[PDB]
Design an enzyme around this catalytic site. Structure first.
Site, PDB file in Angstrom:
ATOM      1  N   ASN A 118      29.162 135.075  65.733  1.00 24.39           N
ATOM      2  CA  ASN A 118      29.665 135.393  64.449  1.00 24.39           C
ATOM      3  C   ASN A 118      28.725 134.973  63.294  1.00 24.39           C
ATOM      4  O   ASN A 118      27.352 134.805  63.509  1.00 24.39           O
ATOM      5  CB  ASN A 118      30.930 134.307  64.207  1.00 24.39           C
ATOM      6  CG  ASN A 118      30.380 132.932  64.078  1.00 24.39           C
ATOM      7  OD1 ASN A 118      29.344 132.499  63.596  1.00 24.39           O
ATOM      8  ND2 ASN A 118      31.090 132.076  65.189  1.00 24.39           N
ATOM      9  N   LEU A 155      26.860 124.623  70.315  1.00 18.96           N
ATOM     10  CA  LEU A 155      27.483 125.708  69.678  1.00 18.96           C
ATOM     11  C   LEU A 155      28.963 124.960  69.596  1.00 18.96           C
ATOM     12  O   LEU A 155      29.947 125.812  69.135  1.00 18.96           O
ATOM     13  CB  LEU A 155      27.320 126.696  70.564  1.00 18.96           C
ATOM     14  CG  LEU A 155      25.902 127.424  70.699  1.00 18.96           C
ATOM     15  CD1 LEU A 155      25.633 128.631  71.424  1.00 18.96           C
ATOM     16  CD2 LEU A 155      25.466 127.632  69.232  1.00 18.96           C
ATOM     17  N   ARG A 191      20.039 141.413  72.709  1.00 18.25           N
ATOM     18  CA  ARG A 191      19.228 140.064  72.660  1.00 18.25           C
ATOM     19  C   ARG A 191      19.359 139.305  73.991  1.00 18.25           C
ATOM     20  O   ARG A 191      20.575 138.927  74.331  1.00 18.25           O
ATOM     21  CB  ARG A 191      19.558 139.289  71.331  1.00 18.25           C
ATOM     22  CG  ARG A 191      18.760 138.080  71.341  1.00 18.25           C
ATOM     23  CD  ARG A 191      19.065 137.346  69.972  1.00 18.25           C
ATOM     24  NE  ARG A 191      18.626 138.154  68.802  1.00 18.25           N
ATOM     25  CZ  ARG A 191      19.499 138.713  68.041  1.00 18.25           C
ATOM     26  NH1 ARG A 191      20.858 138.485  68.271  1.00 18.25           N
ATOM     27  NH2 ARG A 191      19.057 139.315  66.904  1.00 18.25           N
ATOM     28  N   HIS A 209      31.448 128.465  67.946  1.00 17.15           N
ATOM     29  CA  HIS A 209      31.666 129.495  68.171  1.00 17.15           C
ATOM     30  C   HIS A 209      32.831 129.424  69.409  1.00 17.15           C
ATOM     31  O   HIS A 209      33.060 128.260  69.868  1.00 17.15           O
ATOM     32  CB  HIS A 209      30.434 130.032  69.160  1.00 17.15           C
ATOM     33  CG  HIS A 209      29.237 130.219  68.251  1.00 17.15           C
ATOM     34  ND1 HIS A 209      28.806 131.575  67.990  1.00 17.15           N
ATOM     35  CD2 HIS A 209      28.060 129.370  67.973  1.00 17.15           C
ATOM     36  CE1 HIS A 209      27.775 131.438  66.883  1.00 17.15           C
ATOM     37  NE2 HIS A 209      27.501 130.247  66.802  1.00 17.15           N
ATOM     38  N   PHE A 263      28.323 136.520  73.446  1.00 15.64           N
ATOM     39  CA  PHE A 263      27.364 136.066  74.285  1.00 15.64           C
ATOM     40  C   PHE A 263      27.866 135.527  75.301  1.00 15.64           C
ATOM     41  O   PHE A 263      28.897 134.811  75.742  1.00 15.64           O
ATOM     42  CB  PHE A 263      26.363 135.268  73.609  1.00 15.64           C
ATOM     43  CG  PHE A 263      26.876 133.794  73.042  1.00 15.64           C
ATOM     44  CD1 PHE A 263      27.593 133.828  71.858  1.00 15.64           C
ATOM     45  CD2 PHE A 263      26.427 132.641  73.676  1.00 15.64           C
ATOM     46  CE1 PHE A 263      28.041 132.668  71.461  1.00 15.64           C
ATOM     47  CE2 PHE A 263      26.933 131.314  73.183  1.00 15.64           C
ATOM     48  CZ  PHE A 263      27.772 131.480  72.095  1.00 15.64           C
ATOM     49  N   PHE A 320      18.939 130.516  77.900  1.00 18.77           N
ATOM     50  CA  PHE A 320      19.664 130.505  76.824  1.00 18.77           C
ATOM     51  C   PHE A 320      20.956 131.242  77.112  1.00 18.77           C
ATOM     52  O   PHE A 320      22.170 130.762  77.366  1.00 18.77           O
ATOM     53  CB  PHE A 320      18.910 130.581  75.489  1.00 18.77           C
ATOM     54  CG  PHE A 320      19.691 130.308  74.364  1.00 18.77           C
ATOM     55  CD1 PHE A 320      20.969 129.778  74.266  1.00 18.77           C
ATOM     56  CD2 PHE A 320      19.258 130.912  73.092  1.00 18.77           C
ATOM     57  CE1 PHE A 320      21.724 129.376  73.011  1.00 18.77           C
ATOM     58  CE2 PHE A 320      19.780 130.446  71.782  1.00 18.77           C
ATOM     59  CZ  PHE A 320      21.271 129.816  71.888  1.00 18.77           C
ATOM     60  N   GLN A 352      23.140 138.491  74.659  1.00 15.04           N
ATOM     61  CA  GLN A 352      24.117 138.817  73.744  1.00 15.04           C
ATOM     62  C   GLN A 352      24.238 140.189  73.436  1.00 15.04           C
ATOM     63  O   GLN A 352      23.489 140.830  73.726  1.00 15.04           O
ATOM     64  CB  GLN A 352      23.560 138.302  72.236  1.00 15.04           C
ATOM     65  CG  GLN A 352      24.603 138.618  71.193  1.00 15.04           C
ATOM     66  CD  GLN A 352      23.851 137.923  69.786  1.00 15.04           C
ATOM     67  OE1 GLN A 352      22.979 137.234  69.729  1.00 15.04           O
ATOM     68  NE2 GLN A 352      24.694 138.510  68.816  1.00 15.04           N
TER      69      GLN A 352
END
Ligand SMILES: CC(C)[C@H](NC(=O)OC(C)(C)C)C(=O)N[C@H]1Cc2cccc(c2)OCCCCOC(=O)[C@@H]2CCCN(N2)C1=O
EC number: 5.2.1.8
Length: 167
Positions: free
Chosen positions: A104, A124, A57, A128, A115, A62, A65
């Site tokens: 997660n 985040l 992804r 994370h 990521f 952004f 991942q």
């Protein structure tokens, strides 16, 4: 002597063609259990890890991942600890491009997926675990990023053709 934060590398390929190397500093001084998981998965020394896995992804603006080396689509992966493991701490924050952080599925569910931020993602923080940063080759992450899309599907196959530890 002093524990030196490990450096690990990914050699990235795009539809099987070499793109370049991304290297990461792993903050073992702040998150030793999380750093060690990623380090060992990068060398393959337990008998499994990131070599040959894909970035499933990629969302431009952004993050990228990866780390699902068991199911190749974001539903798999495993840590070196024989089970998912705890959020070690949230000392480090998502401050900008290049931050390396754990994916997660809820509190205390870290496995192998991670990521690489390509933007500041401060929302985040506290969700994370940040455990490293790109050291060299942020330009290679920027090149990878161009093969993503709004819904995250990649337009070329992005793989970790090789990986390991430099230092
Ligand atoms: C690691 C696998 C097992 C796990 N699976 C999972 O939780 O499965 C369910 C829902 C229980 C069945 C997953 O992928 N966790 C996601 C959750 C998430 C977080 C934040 C935003 C999310 C999703 O979605 C909004 C934006 C999509 C693009 O951002 C993303 O994809 C993000 C980018 C950061 C890393 N990131 N993925 C994750 O940590």
């Amino acid at each position: 002597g002093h524990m030196v934060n490990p450096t690990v590398f990914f050699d990235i390929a795009v539809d099987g063609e070499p793109l370049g190397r991304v290297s990461f500093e792993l903050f073992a001084d702040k998150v030793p259990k999380t750093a060690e998981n990623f380090r060992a998965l990068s060398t393959g020394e337990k008998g499994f890890g990131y070599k040959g896995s894909c970035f499933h992804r990629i969302i431009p603006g952004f993050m990228c991942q990866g780390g699902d080396f068991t199911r190749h689509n974001g539903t798999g992966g495993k840590s070196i600890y024989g089970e998912k493991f705890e959020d070690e701490n949230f000392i480090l924050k998502h401050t900008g491009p290049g931050i390396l952080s754990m994916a997660n599925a809820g509190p205390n569910t870290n496995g192998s997926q991670f990521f690489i931020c390509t933007a500041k993602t401060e929302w985040l923080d506290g969700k994370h675990v940040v455990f490293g940063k790109v050291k060299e080759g942020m330009n290679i992450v920027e090149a990878m990023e161009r093969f993503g899309s709004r819904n995250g599907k990649t337009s070329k196959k992005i793989t970790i053709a090789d990986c390991g530890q430099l230092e």
